[model samples]
Target: SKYSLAPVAKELQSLLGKDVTFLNDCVGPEVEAAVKASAPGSVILLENLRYHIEEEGSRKVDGQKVKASKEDVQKFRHELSSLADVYINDAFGTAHRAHSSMVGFDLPQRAAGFLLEKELKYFGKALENPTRPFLAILGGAKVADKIQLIDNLLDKVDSIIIGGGMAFTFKKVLENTEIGDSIFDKAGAEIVPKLMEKAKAKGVEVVLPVDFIIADAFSADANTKTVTDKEGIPAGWQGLDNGPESRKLFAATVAKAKTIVWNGPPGVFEFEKFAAGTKALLDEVVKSSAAGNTVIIGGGDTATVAKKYGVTDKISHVSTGGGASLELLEGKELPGVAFLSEKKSLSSKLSVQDLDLKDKRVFIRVDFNVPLDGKKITSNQRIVAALPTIKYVLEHHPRYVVLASHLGRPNGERN
Candidate 1:
């Protein structure tokens, strides 16, 4: 019932217009043999790796989580590595995980898929070299969850618009505002002043809702009322969305921004009555995009909001990952991303194809072994060395060439 990809095998076959061989396992002797037997370009679909406990290193059993032994996990990873010669990571959605299949490959060549490359390019553009007047819209239930994200943005963003249930924590701590029955992050309240102080020191404008729509109960059919900062939310009434005045203030900030990143919804958007804040912000973001602003939806609920408004394609970029994108926005290095191979710099190294061997000192090692069973040297067939390559390499101008050989024994020690 969880993370099963088997049902989609037929759809994949139909889309590719080729027969997709579906395997029952992802890693094992059977899987390795079957993969080796297939044609080089054959499309083989393996079962969900999550089905095996070793893939994630742990699984829940009898209401308790159990971890696989280290040796079993290593063997599983080895089998997976043995099945493929080149590793191409295309699952940008799981790019934040360090799961077995994500990072355990031992291939000579590793690469990113087109979607992942695009994700990196767009995010790099927004974070590394963004245009001035950049604004970040951060929302969610708890300020604790977004503490690192807010802290990171304080250094890069010119302005930050804080909304959703988390805003009540800021109001309570900073302005001593009375927020009744609203979501309050007690742990986040302690560090509220520090975040504001940092923002002020960096000259980053921090925006919070000046008015809120309050509800008598956390339900769609609950009685609601609008309240400004002056008239605080009454006791037993919870704030659900930004009121009209706050939406106008937010829109004004959005209008001046040249680049925008929205991460979460400002309200309980699932409920129509409480969706005005998010809906209004969506309209403003869409308008800003039309005006040539670099607008990015930072996945998760924000992407959901964009999809709901049917403006996903209209946005400049919508991240494919929820947790991965959030972690990237928070300035954390993802394990899956970090493990990918880096592009080799041409200026840094002189490869064989560089053809610049002038004054270069070259050293080549050739290993030659003849297996002896304590009676006689078994075979001399293993001594096929690439001697012609030396002539080919030495054809170009070289200062000197050192030919080293490992003779007799297979092991490195003198025999």
Candidate 2:
């Protein structure tokens, strides 16, 4: 998606008017020269931010820099925040961090932009005192990321339906069932007992898949089978998706819920053969919402699946902030959010409208760590998602410029 910005750029031009210009550099004299030559009310894009080494210095995991650090984040933020009079954080996809642009630029007069506002509005309604009989259907690859959300929502939600590879770990902890070669989080295993105990204490019904769809290999055309008893499957066959029985149970629960929040999928939904369970659950959500129930689909794979199923519009909201949405549900305060509000309050002392950029060049740095395959962009979803806000800025008719960074790596090189 990084190689081809045309689709998204074109879409943005349509929404924001056609006087947009894409630039090659984010900072320095070259950008300044271009801004000086260009007319007012033009949109510009800079070279990928991953070209800088500082962008990669922050990300660390287990004593190693696997992600960006606070210092690196701040350095990048200073560069971007200095360029814009009004800061709008529309990058909900990057909301789960203290990264520079995400958490660094709180200069004042900043707003939560449109996408962030929409995501919060929908998810907030679903979690904060929704219609009765609230149900949360969660599925995904890891349990550790979702553990906090489960812990926080146990008391508020009437039932929590589970699926996906993570369900195997719960099944093993609860029923001592063998999950074969299915993906399971070792860190998540240690907390299963406590999570179950807490759910019981809270009087929340925790539903685990009783049946599963197994595959000989992890492919769409692989031989598939179903196991009724949770423990019936042999070690050779791995569970790739939820079986029919689990689908029925999950659908029934979804149908009855007054408000529903769904994240992840019941299985390897990318593979068509294993998509039935997710499809069933989505159908149920669509039907329930059609019947006046509130349904919100948290982003990430769930949003992708919803779009694929052509039911994205049917749900009340398909969140743009995947990790942020999860963290919010888990009761975590995002540093990115804190920075924006802080900046907005700080800018109140200055008259933002008085500042002008008629012929002057402005460099606004941003986080654009979108995925890529060679020179082709595998998905323009993120770019398309940011178009509205970008267009709004262009409409203001300033000498606008954009600076952005891409996926993190050692030396911040694009590989």
Candidate 3:
């Protein structure tokens, strides 16, 4: 089963009068056989949704879709929704999207499963009514993806700490530094001035990397150097991590916050030499958490970095679905979330299973697994990545047990 669909099927099958039958193949003949074998009280799992070329939005070499339209999304919804009497969406991994399956199920009787509700509860609290002096820590590879999220949260949060590859874009925008071969979002560069202006108007503090850890190559064994300021990054050296000064600055910010939400890492934590900034931040978050502050770590590399530093359990929340967690922070209504709300609002027309998670034992298996090296759990990224969702689950006090995730391998192949 695909990571998104498996948990939904499992929950549906756990109902009073249901038996699950999963069809290994998804094409013409296998689908027909599975449909024929399915009884009235049995659930049939379909093939991988991505196996069909149409689902991928066929595109040419230049990145233009061959047949992309709203109609394709609608048709996809109709075809997928027709199979089941009621649709349960536990696929938060894709919740940031407006794609067919992610949103279209709402046209029918659909509901958010346990995982989605948990995501909203914690993330909603972190943003909607956060404690005074709330801080938002953001990092990662691209600025283009987080421009809206940053712009949206500027007014709401007290301080915003930025690092990682995206920090180079801000450095380029403000300091005119030569970032070398570093990853910079070109589209985001165009909008930097406006974003800074907006932050200034809102009295929001936007902090960029004051200093950076530079490397000759993006590798653990690469020749490393330290640049004292963002403007001082040398021409041929790429920034692989935050410098010591940035760690101290970020740590001070974390120390003062009553509520903190973090997404991604300040630097590339995959290599031991460059993991200092992320590791330092994790220490601050743990110290804050010990003092009873609300620390919510969102999905993806931030969570991974936390676990890598062995401070995951100290944080307040770890989100299960990375993409979904970000959308919630941006205050966007996820399709899975909308589905749950709809069912709850229209309870008379739907069954209890489709309404809410009250007294329901929900098992949510998410896709937090990552590539591993041997049996050592080489990286704690995926485990730490789930902090936000985990925090939500713990806070809401869900009676049901929620499973985070485990690493998966296809045919015993690590890659």
Candidate 4:
């Protein structure tokens, strides 16, 4: 089916001003024939791998889903590997999955793309060694989803901000504050005390919303009121967003943080009337970024909020992945990243200065995943980061500087 790359082929060609060959299938004799026939520097856009069940190793058979046979999966992996000389995985969003494409490449030179490298570096730096007063802002509807995240961060962050719908459960359980019709994660409520105990033992500050924007109904035009923890939420009403007092408290805490990692929104930002809390927090984050504090938007909804406020560029790094980031924050190793070649320390043995680069081929694994909004380039940070090394290599007079990078995932129409 020409449902995926075919539509983008012409647009891609126009953007690059190069010939793009659109193949109908990703794996077949016809695809092999075209790949072999292509000249050097040719651009080939294959059909969506998902069109075949073997790519994902499963598909719907009639009304029921079925897994592909083991032999068929191996054949598919073999066919895909035959088309490329070196393998580069840049799809950090799918880094957690052990899918065929993510790990089946048998190429000798398996590498991480720029985007994957950036994701790893940012996350590793934050987790491994961060400046003092590290803070993590976590939100969303259910605390069940973030239990591991909070548990992991308890060891790293100095303070943790808990907001959004999940805070209602925390408040109700810990302080006996009446949450009324607000969201109550029954499963999450059970573990709240344990989490608090861990935080208390670690001497980490757990900041919860002290007040909320109470809504009569879950609607943009619902009757609203501001209520503190002392004056609990009334029956039949819900806390939709953070109140003014809570916002000020959150802002004050954010102002003192030297490094921040935010994972979710503070309120139901989808509703215009309830966006104030999220917007206010975003303002403080932007100000902190300007003050030279490392502010990391931990992908997903937090990343969306940065984009929504046109501050994506202002933040230090808006992660390109959600689940991958969450897993990383939870102290889990990502298969896609773990499979990439490790960086050998330059301090010992031979270094870049020791190499004789005159008229030699230098394969530089560089990060060039430029952030793009449609056809427009939003930021050149990727290019800027590589400039010093590139300039040094250029000065050394290498005959060829072969820079390799993978940008964006082949997500088909979903992209």
Best by TM-score: 4
Q: How high a TM-score does candidate 4 get? A: 0.82
CA lDDT of every candidate? 0.71, 0.68, 0.64, 0.74
Clashes of each: 0, 19, 17, 0
- Model 2 whole-model lDDT (C-alpha atoms): 0.68
Residue-wise C-alpha lDDT for candidate 3, range 178-239, written one tens digit per residue? 67778778999998899889989987788888888899888899998887763576666789
Deviation of model 1 at 234, angstroms: 1.0
Once fitted onto the true fold, the runs of candidate 4 whose alpha carbons sit more than 4 angstroms away are: 1-3, 14-18, 60-63, 343-415
RMSD per prediction, one decimal? Answer: 15.7, 4.8, 7.3, 5.7
- The predicted structure with the larger TM-score, 3 or 4, is 4
Mark the regions of model 1 whose C-alpha exceeds 4 Å error after superposition: 1-3, 343-415
In angstroms, the error of model 4 at 228 is 1.3
TM-score of each: 0.81, 0.81, 0.71, 0.82
lDDT by residue (tens digit), candidate 2, 95-209 = 6765555655555555565566566567666667788788998897789878888888886888999889889888877788877777778899899999999988877888888
Q: What are the per-residue Cα lDDT tens digits for candidate 1 across 1-415?
A: 2233343344444544546566666667887677666653455666656667776677666668688898988887787776644455545556687777667776545555445556666776677678879999998999998999999989899999999999999998888788989999999998999999999999999999999999999999999999987789888999999999999999999998999999988889999999999999999999999999999999678988987888987899888678888987898877767767564221121223334444543332211222445433343322222323344344654443322222231121112
* lDDT string, candidate 4, 337-393, tens digits: 555555621111122344555554333434344555654435655445544444454
* Stretches of model 3 off by over 4 angstroms after superposition: 1-20, 25-46, 54-79, 106-108, 175-190, 333-415
Candidate 4, pairs of clashing residues: none
Locate the minimum summed-lDDT window of 10 residues in model 4.
344-353
TM-score of 2: 0.81
lDDT top scorer: 4
